[PDB]
Design a protein around this ligand. Structure first.
Ligand code: ADP
Ligand code: ADP
Ligand code: ADP
Ligand code: ADP
Ligand code: ADP
Ligand code: BEF
Ligand code: BEF
Ligand code: BEF
Ligand code: MG
Ligand code: MG
Ligand code: MG
Ligand code: MG
Lengths: 322, 314, 321, 321, 303, 304
């Protein structure tokens, strides 16, 4: 009975990934819903008294790579509560009955450590609409999930069941009834893309301006957040390729701060960068040409049919996440 | 053994018969089946036998577990709210011993009532499933549901199921009373809004509740509850939109108003202490915004499958 | 935990197949990307700090038999890291809920032995777009890979997930999102074919020149690397066939026997069975044996699979030279 | 561990069926290729040192009943090495993730006994081009085969994957790349037909000569080796039919009795049940029984699958002749 | 598993009878013959229209050979699990070679596979190829084990399976003497007044039927007297109370039921020609006409 | 899983079905009554299929045959065999035939032969081939006297043709008639206190054309609870004979309040009426579709 809690104690993370609300570019409706879900019942407990109850479940859905796990990291950072990060490897067991006793002990620990947050990434693996799947695991896990979510003699009060999935239409109808907040996280718009570029570039010394970031956001038409992250990564790795595949360096302005340039200048010394020791390194600064080359190299991942499926799911049972 | 100390609840959740909006036939059937053998014990003897099996079904989120909570509140009897988690073990034979001792304790604690939520977790139709944990448990439940001569006085089995066509036909025939819980009508919608608002101050009238129930076309009970929750949370969002606060009348009860007024004290909202914030009142516009936000959680395929099931086994 | 680690301890290869970067011909973009993402964070760790992070996953796709596993062998040789080479037999198990703990313990061992490189050959078998596959094991192993790659409470820093598949359009969209660099490995051009011929012939005694290698590389149009390897193997096997059909031997220059035309100076007419070892002299390689091997062995890949690979490249990939 | 080896120990054959290389008619190129690839690394291992490596997989395709399994029996006879005869029932299992472990254990058992031969009969039943078949079985078994043949951390040196199929155009492109030599086994010609007649007549008493066998081989054009074997068996059973369907008998010259016409020298009428042992003499063979068997049994090969086999040969095939 | 049907109980099918007789009797009775190149037949396909005594002839060979028999069917070698419908065939051939010499009877070989055209490709290919490897293979050495296959549709088989089956014997429609002999063995030991000319006219009338059709019309003509005993009134005491049914109203037509009739005294009426005429006028032929053309074509290119 | 009993159901205990009983009785009872009639190649029926819409008590009729043949009744449900028992089912079908052999004269009753035999083209291996392959072998057990198999089906159209063919004799069990429905009402109320006359019973009979015994049973169970129903829930009440029974507004001595207001055991439950059942008839529709008379009669025409 204690080995179950010892196995489930590895699902409570204590690393606290530093993702703040200013790190998330856009998604103001989802951020406001998560704020009124977690920040308010701990900061202002004198408002949720009587017939006013907080939210008891939020389903984040959308295209792959839009920021659902990033909002989960931001909630785990700024929640100041117990965060349960479970998956299909922490609930399914080899024996018989342990696959439901683990879920019962997980919800018992979540109710014992209230206020607590249960984050189940990829809820479509556990809830497979119980029509054709494996009888034992599917039926028992889904029914125990329903009973531990509301049930009769459980009274789940103060816990939050976060869920992030890419396939929202393959959920069970009872699970979709349990998740009382269907929040659609879409692909980012122009202002969100420009703020995401401003966040991902950071304190790197570059000649880019706000008009340059605006033209970059206008260029990335249909990109996702991971695609913006990898074109920022490619544009940041571009000065390393510039300092690798070039010769005829030149000391600019400091203990020989030498920089690659055109062959033939005021001191175009023909040597290699491997002989250059550290801290006499003046790499070329970022321009718009490196980000244009990163845009030309890296291609968008999300197609234009899954967007139609997510749009049909929003018009069927979904809200908007701005 | 002693592991069944969590199947019975001692909380008694305060859900009375007036809280259950609508469902008059199911309410009166559960009422007679839980009251009349305790009210008039001479009425049930021999031929005129009471109901020993009650099954509830319909769309998901219509009031099955709510009716079970109402029975557990206004029954005055031992409630056995147990599911498939406390019936299956790692060993062999203990999965039958659990059901045997469960029915033994339920017969020893007469008058009792056993409520099995999601009974399809025990009825996998034994196609190619787990033998020792499916078929033997199903036959044990079939021979322990043979209390038409054994448990004439005492226990009563219940059932709540969202998907009732995937159910074993033997236990379906053993459940003699199968009541279909439908989507609520307009009067049930209006009294459900009246119950869910409750003692919260508002300006909503009976005509406002009637047009709210007319706007909710095809909504369910949980959808009505989360619409009421969103309408309750909307004045907190209006306070969070803090601009040009204004004091009303005791001991500095502030209230935000339109930008540009008489006495528009432009300040924040977190600088003020508690118990002096006169919150705005519930209009109909926040309710209409919650209606436009919240979507119905049920589809048309489940409704036609429920219609097929009730026309096949009404 | 310890049983799964004892089962997964036979996945770290300690063989180190000696394939260097000069052995691979062509594929300059794939070479440069693998070179930075393998060599640079373990050689110069002071550069990758702050906003600069290395590549966390590289996918190699193309027609069958182009050099994806050869590039993986070169990475495993020149990586100086704990090279994890898994497939669909080390992860899938018989019991219930034991295939996910295998992947979790694999990624835990990769994080415990960082810097590490995970090479999953034929990723198309594990990931099948989770549309109509076998529900429990398929969807759970896909969601377990998706959680263990980046996830929330994992923070995979230092590991690398290499992929090598022949059919990349059957990959899941989230898995294609995880593989942040799709590198297309195409059919080789004339300089790469000439370099592969010079590498595969190598130190063999032959009279072949640069013009002969250029004509061979111009002749093998549409061929692949395995086809070049087997025509070099057939051209090397042909002197043993000439030794088999070697009537009228001729000892030219400790009695090194050499076949010739029937009837010559010193035409000792015998067979090669009675001739003992450590004195044989094989005939030299000419361009005629290689032309015979080219006329004997056909190419493997056709011209519609290349169209599908180019379609996937222009839709969701980059050109890897 | 013990279960997989106990299940795969039955795949090794030790009976050694005696079929020599002279028992196969024709197929000179296939005979030469199989002869070198099974004999030369076993007999003379000093010829393949470094740059020259033997063949690592041979596909024997063609029409059904052409001598593919007979050629595999000849290789298993004069191989002098370990022979693995696997099929679909020995690799495919009922449990989840058990067939891939069986293929891995099969190749690991074959690598411990180098040199070894793995004769996967009917590779078309285990390779279905990964297009539309069963997801788990198809993708996982084909992926385990593609990884286990060469792979990265395998180093398959000293093995040979012999494959015999009838529909080679329904194979995967990666599997066709894996099989190096795709040798065509075409229909036999006149010389192979006469050689099959000369080896199928055996040592039975007959009056047939070389020109008789040449005329028979000219008459059986459009047939195959199984058809030649069944007309030889039918012509061998025709004198037993003449024994059984006869009433008038005759003792010629310890009672070497033979049937006769009704009315002869000593036309004794009795039965073969009354005929005891060591006294029965069969009638002699002639061209009439062979012509009757040829006119009695019809061929089995059609004329469009031969065109498809010729198309696959012209696309990606060698010549066995 | 041993039936009790000898050679004489099968009517007609002379070529199939002599072929099976030599192929399963010649090695087991004369071991001094099959030496050297003389090998027995290792496969026989018995096709044709259904109901024409194929399993009856298989039981005749199972009786008269005095050897071990295996009488599995198509549904026995088809499972729902993945890769379990081939280990059954492997264990079948293993237990056949364990008790050599043996006879293997496989029914509905057209329904065992699906000629890998449109059905389940994985299961079809694995079943077919495992059947072929268990038939000849490489290290399977099937000597003395006879594969006796029977089917109703031969043209939906595979080229490799029809190559593995050596002698493709056709079971045709029965003839006049076969129909009369089938009537004579189907009527049994019941008290009858039927003659050989009556059997000849019956067999001339039932041209185009099958053996199962002849069996069920003999069963109908045998059940019709005990049907007319029960479904009749106004019985007649002929000649210690021998009662016989007649028309209502006769020379002493006693109207009663069969409940008050004493045991071992009720006169059962003998069956006549009109019962068989009613049976043949009631029963219709079952076979089609294009299947005979398909059998003609199959014999025409695989005679 | 296998029931066994020496039942005591006479022909007269089975309402109606006189036409079906006479043919079935002559087929089975005549053989048993006068066995000397069946020497040689004349052999009694040993398979009989009973088919017709549900709610006709095909089971009850089957027990009557057993009672009248003076045989042990052995019985099994095919639905249970196929689902509940699952694998042990082969063993069960065996043991069943084995018991019956050991206990001649005896009768095997297989109920819902349609829930077992399903044409074997798409069924699962163990239940399909094993369950449907063992029954057939056993019904060939006539050849290896003394036992009879009676199959029961509601949906004969859905009955495996192979199984179908083992049931030489087929007998249609039709829906009930006026006299029988009248008897069913009487039996179903039996001793219960009520004021129904002989004529009321006939009325109830006449008013339930197309109902089955089952239907009538459900309707009667409903009606008998009406006086309890009235006593439990009444707006106003009234003293009689002190016992307060429910009465309409402003009845003689009509005091309105609620059942809750009234003392326990002094509450008067309403008396039983013929009219009240009429209520119950309206709220229970018949079970059996009207196309059944033809579908069953098609079978009587074809295999009767
Ligand atoms: N909306 C966003 N705002 C900020 N960063 C983002 C956003 N979307 C993606 N990213 C960046 O790209 C990564 C991919 O997003 P992630 O949280 O992994 O999405 P997912 O839930 O699909 O797994 C993030 O970790 C972050 O670095
Ligand atoms: N008849 C009803 N009266 C009041 N609220 C109801 C009713 N039916 C549904 N609801 C609302 O919807 C919820 C659904 O009922 P609940 O017992 O939680 O689950 P379920 O109906 O799925 O068993 C209730 O908790 C309540 O908030
Ligand atoms: N690009 C290449 N550069 C050098 N050698 C190559 C190349 N492509 C193929 N080869 C040669 O052909 C063989 C086939 O490549 P391999 O790694 O097996 O490819 P795959 O990934 O398809 O399994 C290599 O082992 C090598 O000998
Ligand atoms: N060239 C040949 N020499 C000798 N026998 C042959 C030859 N070709 C075919 N046969 C005979 O034909 C039969 C078919 O052999 P096999 O290779 O098993 O055909 P397949 O593999 O196509 O089914 C063998 O029994 C063999 O004796
Ligand atoms: N030619 C025949 N000779 C003797 N009996 C026959 C003949 N044809 C059919 N029968 C009888 O008909 C019955 C049914 O035949 P069956 O074995 O079902 O045919 P098949 O073998 O084609 O399935 C058998 O019991 C058999 O006795
Ligand atoms: F890939 Be993410 F979880 F949408
Ligand atoms: F209808 Be509820 F979800 F039980
Ligand atoms: F491209 Be290879 F065959 F993996
Ligand atoms: Mg995510
Ligand atoms: Mg509920
Ligand atoms: Mg590769
Ligand atoms: Mg073969």
């Amino acid at each position: 009975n204690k080995k179950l809690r010892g196995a489930l104690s590895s699902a409570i993370l204590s690393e606290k990934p530093n993702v703040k609300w200013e790190d998330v570019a856009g998604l103001e409706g989802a951020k406001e819903a998560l704020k009124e879900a977690v920040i308010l019942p701990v900061k202002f407990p004198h408002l949720f008294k009587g017939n006013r109850k907080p939210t008891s479940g939020i389903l984040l859905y959308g295209p792959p790579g839009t920021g659902k796990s990033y909002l989960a990291k931001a909630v785990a950072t700024e929640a100041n509560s117990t965060f349960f990060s479970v998956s299909s490897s922490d609930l399914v067991s080899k024996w018989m009955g342990e696959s439901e006793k683990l879920v019962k002990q997980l919800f018992a620990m979540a109710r014992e450590n209230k206020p607590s947050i249960i984050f189940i990434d990829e809820v479509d693996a556990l809830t497979g609409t119980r029509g054709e799947g494996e009888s034992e695991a599917s039926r028992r896990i889904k029914t125990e999930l329903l009973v531990q979510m509301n049930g009769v003699g459980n009274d789940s009060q103060g816990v939050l069941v976060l869920g992030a999935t890419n396939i929202p239409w393959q959920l069970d109808s009872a699970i979709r009834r349990r998740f009382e907040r269907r929040i659609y996280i879409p692909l980012p718009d122009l202002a969100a893309r420009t703020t995401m570029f401003e966040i991902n570039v950071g304190d790197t010394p570059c000649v880019l301006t706000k008009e340059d970031y605006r033209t970059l956001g206008a260029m990335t038409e249909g990109y996702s957040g991971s695609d913006i992250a990898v074109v920022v990564k490619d544009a940041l790795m571009q000065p390393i390729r510039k300092i690798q595949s070039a010769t005829h360096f030149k000391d600019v302005s400091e203990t020989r701060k030498l920089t690659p340039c055109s062959p033939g200048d005021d001191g175009a010394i023909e040597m290699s960068w491997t002989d250059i020791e550290a801290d006499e390194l003046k790499e070329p600064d970022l321009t718009i040409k490196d980000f244009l080359k990163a845009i030309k190299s890296t291609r968008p991942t999300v197609n234009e049919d899954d967007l139609l499926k997510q749009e049909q799911f929003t018009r069927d049972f979904g809200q908007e996440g701005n």
